[PDB]
Symmetry: C3
Subunit: 316 residues, 3 copies
């Protein structure tokens, strides 16, 4: 089917951690960018308007661009950039399945590295794996890093000379992340993305993960892991069988990454919380203002197209 939608690029500010507001170039004014969910073989048309002061493009990472290389989104290679105020249309066929993503391809060290110019592109295969048919919850986790020194300074950052001192999943640093709420017998698909410039060793307490896909393609030899290393550009899909009720933290195991501005704890941390486990008064998230769509799990259930999420929106 043909799926057409409209995306903008906006100058907004998001809160990454307590105390750290960050100027970003958000697709539809949000970080992560909107979810795009389509079916294998769909024809996609994306109309992009740059409402920022700098040039950008959008590259569709994982999308082959078969016979459509001029929609690959690479400035000086496949197109001239989308200047401030201008618009550009991408057209491609979603013939490559799985967990893909999209991001700016201008000034990538800064724009992708610290300005939030990325989001998920999920292509459902015609022939999912049998285990994918058992999935009851689909979870997107996009990891990235932040350089507090350039939080207010578009046009700066993302170099070797900078210091990445904050770390996140879906643009929040613990405790501003959200729990992964499950119930016993859930079958949870988690998609990890190396969205920013860091490496993330994603470890699930209480559970092993079955690694089923690399860069959205199914492995002939899936393997179990309790820690999955995710580097820039990569995706890994896993399955967790939610058969062990408790509260089980789930986090980046790289030691410096569970800090925030040199303070601990922080960083890419969530908690697998099972329904019905009694809550101790000392539980760090006992009073959480819960967002069930923090990992796009609700959006993923609502059809094919483009989805914004108000909890990812920044301020103008």
């Amino acid at each position: 089917a043909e799926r057409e939608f409209d995306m903008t690029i906006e100058e907004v500010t998001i809160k990454v951690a307590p105390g750290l507001d960050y100027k970003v170039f958000g697709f539809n004014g949000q970080v992560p960018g909107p979810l795009i969910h389509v079916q294998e073989g769909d024809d996609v048309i994306v109309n992009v308007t740059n409402n920022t002061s700098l040039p950008h493009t959008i590259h569709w990472h994982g999308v082959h661009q078969k016979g459509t290389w001029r929609s690959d989104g690479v400035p000086g290679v496949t197109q001239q950039p989308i200047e401030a105020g201008d618009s550009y249309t991408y057209k491609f066929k979603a013939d490559r399945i799985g967990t893909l993503w999209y991001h700016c391809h201008v000034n990538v060290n800064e724009h992708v590295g610290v300005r939030g110019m990325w989001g998920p592109l999920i292509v459902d295969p015609k022939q999912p794996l049998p285990i994918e048919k058992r999935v009851t919850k689909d979870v997107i986790m996009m990891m990235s890093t932040w350089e507090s020194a350039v939080a207010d300074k578009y046009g700066e950052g993302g170099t070797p000379m900078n210091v990445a001192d904050y770390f996140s999943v879906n643009a929040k640093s613990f405790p501003l992340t959200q729990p992964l709420r499950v119930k016993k017998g859930d079958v949870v698909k988690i998609r990890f993305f190396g969205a920013g410039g860091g490496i993330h060793a994603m470890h699930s307490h209480g559970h092993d993960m079955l690694v089923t896909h690399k860069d959205g393609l199914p492995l002939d030899s899936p393997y179990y892991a309790d820690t999955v290393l995710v580097s820039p550009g990569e995706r890994y899909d896993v399955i967790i069988e939610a058969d062990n009720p408790g509260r089980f933290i789930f986090h980046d195991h790289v030691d410096t990454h569970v800090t925030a501005g040199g303070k601990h704890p922080g960083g890419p941390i969530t908690v697998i919380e099972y329904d019905g486990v009694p809550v101790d008064d000392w539980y760090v998230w006992k009073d959480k203002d819960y967002d069930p769509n923090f990992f796009y799990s609700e959006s993923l259930k609502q059809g094919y197209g483009m989805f914004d999420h108000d909890g990812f929106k920044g301020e103008f």
Copy 2:
């Protein structure tokens, strides 16, 4: 079987490198912590006493805690921390096989990153791979990194702002590491652990490694490698067939990791030393004061239980 262990947490100083003494929080006063070696299905009980000035926990990495989540060791999530001077008891069934490990889960960037709060937990499968049955030597290699600026000062370290300038296997930097001594026909299982905050590209000269297990679970499709990347939290088990007598260095291939305080050589380096090879006068480790248990290989042969090792012990104040 029910297996019960009494563990302490101690403030000691260890020598990581020539001229680098480091204040650590050593389980039973050693870094790596004691080896815990049990069988699949055992019921484990660990009574922990905190003899340091700061709060800690112990998390059992890879242990599922099936029905026992309150023993997962995570402060603010599954327990309150073990305060200084206090005790706490962990109980879990070892129903997850393979190379596991344990580490503090309080202030982890510092405690696990530079204070040595970690050790190996080996769970023997009831049904091991056939190749595992050919093994004649079992070897633990726990890699980590150290920030010399915070060596003498608990309470700091383990941030992006710090500089990790020393590197080790089992908490020593070459030349203070020990050789891996084999003889022709040995079948060597090596268990790599990303215990600290760095990445380590472990390369064996003279041999390929057959990678058989990821995070302690056997791969359906094992593969050969001469360089295995190990990142925080992970374990890899490999087999080396010792069929090539020589002196073959075995080291982290990340170029800045074979330094110590900005000087070379140093870092996570050993040598696969074959017994039959005559020693040259210029060999760096001629006459080495040798520790046969530097990789826990002797302890690993001594039955199920918990094993200290004095080559890992630090000095009390």
Copy 3:
């Protein structure tokens, strides 16, 4: 067969980036060092003369040294170093197949990390995989990093206190790299090497890669990837089916690596250029002064031997 080669080590300066000339210790005066291409089972003899001011060795990474450990090239372990002015002969049997490499093993953090002391050693199996049979182009990509503060002075570099601020493939930083020119229907074997001390997330636009070999040995379970993480010491071999004509960039996805001295773009970037695609006025590499052997692809067709390449030579 017995194959005997004479190699030298020379003090030369190379141009890594616009703005960065670097003093290196080039094997045969070039970086990458010469391609050594031999067959499984050959007896190799390499006579090395050290025409530099500092001691060196050559270690043959991935070569087992069966019966020949004294040629392993490790100072203080298998030999005394080759002093300045002196010569030394290596002998080994190439019984280990695949993508191997060679590098100095004296002061490795500096000599291999920033002084270019490395090159490729390709051992052809007497029995290649079936996929290798279809290959029409063979490509070598050796990634490394550079520290501009020590560019002019041997004896410093390669420590955690230094700053790696330039990144390359085959010792050039974009735009001084060269395109990978292909034609529709090509079957491209690419061999990635982690020659320096960095990690490189190599991502091909427009195509998936079939990962067929790890450290030169064929995988029982090959797998597709669009991004392959290459770390120090490792090699990965992939296959790309060149069936999607366009201009498709191919680069390290680690965000800070696509910079050069703090500025973007730079780093390990190439473009898969298909013959016949019209060149746009704004194409960055329009009119490139092209080197068809930048990835050793011409040398790799020339049989067994040791191959210098003038494009890699430094100046005295």
